Design an enzyme around this catalytic site. Structure first.
Site, PDB file in Angstrom:
ATOM      1  N   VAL C  45       0.808  -1.219   0.000  1.00 19.59           N
ATOM      2  CA  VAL C  45       0.000   0.000   0.000  1.00 19.59           C
ATOM      3  C   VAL C  45       0.847   1.278   0.000  1.00 19.59           C
ATOM      4  O   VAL C  45       0.571   2.222  -0.746  1.00 19.59           O
ATOM      5  CB  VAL C  45      -0.933   0.032   1.226  1.00 19.59           C
ATOM      6  CG1 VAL C  45      -1.809   1.276   1.214  1.00 19.59           C
ATOM      7  CG2 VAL C  45      -1.796  -1.210   1.251  1.00 19.59           C
ATOM      8  N   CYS C  46       1.875   1.296   0.844  1.00 13.97           N
ATOM      9  CA  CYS C  46       2.655   2.504   1.103  1.00 13.97           C
ATOM     10  C   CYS C  46       3.235   3.185  -0.139  1.00 13.97           C
ATOM     11  O   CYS C  46       3.282   4.419  -0.180  1.00 13.97           O
ATOM     12  CB  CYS C  46       3.793   2.180   2.070  1.00 13.97           C
ATOM     13  SG  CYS C  46       3.192   1.560   3.657  1.00 13.97           S
ATOM     14  N   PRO C  47       3.685   2.395  -1.148  1.00 14.94           N
ATOM     15  CA  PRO C  47       4.322   3.014  -2.314  1.00 14.94           C
ATOM     16  C   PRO C  47       3.445   4.053  -3.011  1.00 14.94           C
ATOM     17  O   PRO C  47       3.950   5.094  -3.397  1.00 14.94           O
ATOM     18  CB  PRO C  47       4.596   1.821  -3.237  1.00 14.94           C
ATOM     19  CG  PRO C  47       4.750   0.681  -2.343  1.00 14.94           C
ATOM     20  CD  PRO C  47       3.789   0.924  -1.204  1.00 14.94           C
ATOM     21  N   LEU C  50       3.516   7.373  -1.114  1.00 17.43           N
ATOM     22  CA  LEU C  50       4.814   8.000  -1.238  1.00 17.43           C
ATOM     23  C   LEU C  50       5.000   8.546  -2.650  1.00 17.43           C
ATOM     24  O   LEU C  50       5.601   9.613  -2.834  1.00 17.43           O
ATOM     25  CB  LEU C  50       5.930   6.997  -0.883  1.00 17.43           C
ATOM     26  CG  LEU C  50       5.972   6.574   0.580  1.00 17.43           C
ATOM     27  CD1 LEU C  50       6.728   5.257   0.752  1.00 17.43           C
ATOM     28  CD2 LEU C  50       6.607   7.679   1.390  1.00 17.43           C
TER      29      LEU C  50
END
Ligand SMILES: [Cl-]
Ligand SMILES: [Cl-]
Ligand SMILES: [Cl-]
Ligand SMILES: [Cl-]
Ligand SMILES: [Cl-]
Ligand SMILES: [K+]
Ligand SMILES: [K+]
Ligand SMILES: [K+]
Ligand code: NA
Lengths: 164, 163, 164, 165, 162
Positions: C45-47, C50
């Protein structure tokens, strides 16, 4: 009670005759002061007590007495109340906002479970000393004429020590 | 932050749509809730932020989301503001008064030197768990439509655990 | 919350554009800064989050805003992630590693039972004051557009005291 | 202040109409009460104040209101003052002696560096709740007619709560 | 040192041959265990030591010895390191992630000012008792054949008291 004790330092915003001002204890030095506490703006009983002081305000000022009403509402709220109520609109003295409760706690006058001041009046002499205290429950009413009497008597004793 | 913690018990008076009521944590149980804190009634910026939320209130109520605005003013003052401001007049959700500061402090949201709440929004799920937090300084402004997006997302994740 | 408080001193290693650098609070003095916390490298999820900030990074730089992403992974891990993921490869801002968790705890943003930072974003002005905070639970998502709107409004009111 | 709190239990000797009696909080239950504190017997200002209350005492009794004056002197001293002063002589209400200062301190009303009570008046309702407080410095004086007004107002709002003018 | 003490309970995620698993103290009971700590994934030096150990792994498996590598990286990172490095890729034992540092701190092996484990190896018997400890600074190696020496011996004294 706090009788014969010296008032504590404070710094509060107030609404006074169309403007916002700052009031501190330095403003009370060398003057007679009345601190008039009440629980809340936009309630039904308070205005006539405050209104009764407004009716006597010209006479108080001639006696060199400054009046500060205090509740834990903000000075923004006082300004609105002053615009919306015709009783409050006749107030020309300073309406202090005490939303931190610090001024109210200085006078040991906070209802902690409500966050509102009790109905208390304190008369303070030019040296900062409390000379009279009146506190009443809801509905019992504070008579501004009896307040004037006490102030004149307190001023008298100050000028003529050794007789009542 | 208070993220993923459970809201604390409280009991406050409120003005809602023409009457005075009591609101407690038990009224939040089993519902989605938004707690929308602001500094003071009868100031200039706050109303369009509160009014923004009011515009989205029908939709929120369709999503089963209750809204509570909170300041350290009284419910009396909320009622007065509601009768004096065209913008505040739009509000049909509960306006909670928090003159003791207890509800504000529950959410660790008091400016103690001022006795006013900071501009913070908390999204709380039916189990009492804070799922989103937004706090801004003066002038910066909270976007009610970003709030709705987050609420919808929060509901989706609740309804599709693991994805 | 930490709103209107000053950021605390810190010293961390970071990966920025092929190089390892040291970041301290001195690098943020006199600048606008975004601290973008996330839980873990090499998750899925994080990408996106960012990468969305990376998409705005040119404009943020134009506005005098630095970005620091932060997780409790090392700067070694950030370098590898930057090589392996083409979304992370877009990132030209500093990726801070916080394996002691100290920077994350300065911002009161540690999930202590997991040793991972919560999904929180802080906007910090040139005097080190936190002007905006956003925290979300897993799966809700942070929108970089709203972040950009908030930065512009914060910059506006710094420039025009009183106004909007 | 102590406004809207319940009075604390106490037990004190008093002089009243030629007799010594004991007074406790049980004697105040179901009655309106006025606790009138003053500093010291056999002084010169106090008796006009006690005398003013004395003048209004019949009226107070027809309103169901009991009066207790309190100083840190003994009840023996009250009895002697009552024989010696023509003003004090017209007092028919109870004169409570408080030599331990416990009744005075219950009302938070002790001048500690003098061991004398301050000039405070408390109005207490039939449930023991303090509904009005007045405290003054020396020379300012307490007006018994203003006290009577406050007592009638308190009786009124007790009988007719929430009524508003 | 922690010698001859019982290991503390723990619950950690790990990467082991293509998949994610949970490891707890219960998975060591009744088995010989080596806990091999190292400071950080995706650095240069550590893979050979982990590799050295990997080489001897089937031999260990036939001695009844489970292997656990540990760093304060996550298991996500371990998985990723596995794909990236030929050396690491040849690991078949469990790579435990210890992001909270609790497992590392149970073995009093945290460099607190870096948030990384020191280079320490612990041998634990089926009763949970630490029977051998080795710690080395960066650069000095940990040779796996010496670890097999120590383990075989440790097993000897267990079955043959005195
Ligand atoms: Cl007082
Ligand atoms: Cl928070
Ligand atoms: Cl925060
Ligand atoms: Cl009092
Ligand atoms: Cl050890
Ligand atoms: K308030
Ligand atoms: K880590
Ligand atoms: K005495
Ligand atoms: Na009180």
């Amino acid at each position: 009670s706090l009788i014969n004790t010296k008032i504590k330092p404070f710094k509060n915003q107030a609404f006074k005759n169309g403007e916002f001002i700052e009031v501190t204890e330095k403003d009370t030095e060398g003057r007679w002061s009345v601190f008039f506490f009440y629980p809340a703006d936009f309630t039904f009983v308070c205005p006539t007590q405050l209104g009764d002081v407004a009716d006597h305000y010209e006479e108080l000022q001639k006696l060199g007495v400054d009046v500060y009403s205090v509740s834990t509402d903000t000075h923004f709220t006082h300004k609105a109340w002053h615009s919306s109520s015709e009783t409050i609109a006749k107030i020309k003295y300073a309406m202090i906002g005490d939303p931190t409760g610090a001024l109210t706690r200085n006078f040991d006058n906070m209802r902690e479970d409500e966050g509102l001041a009790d109905r208390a009046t304190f008369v303070v002499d030019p040296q900062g000393i409390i000379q009279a205290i009146e506190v009443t429950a809801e509905g019992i009413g504070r008579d501004a004429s009896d307040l004037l009497r006490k102030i004149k008597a307190a001023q008298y004793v100050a000028a003529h020590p050794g007789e009542v």
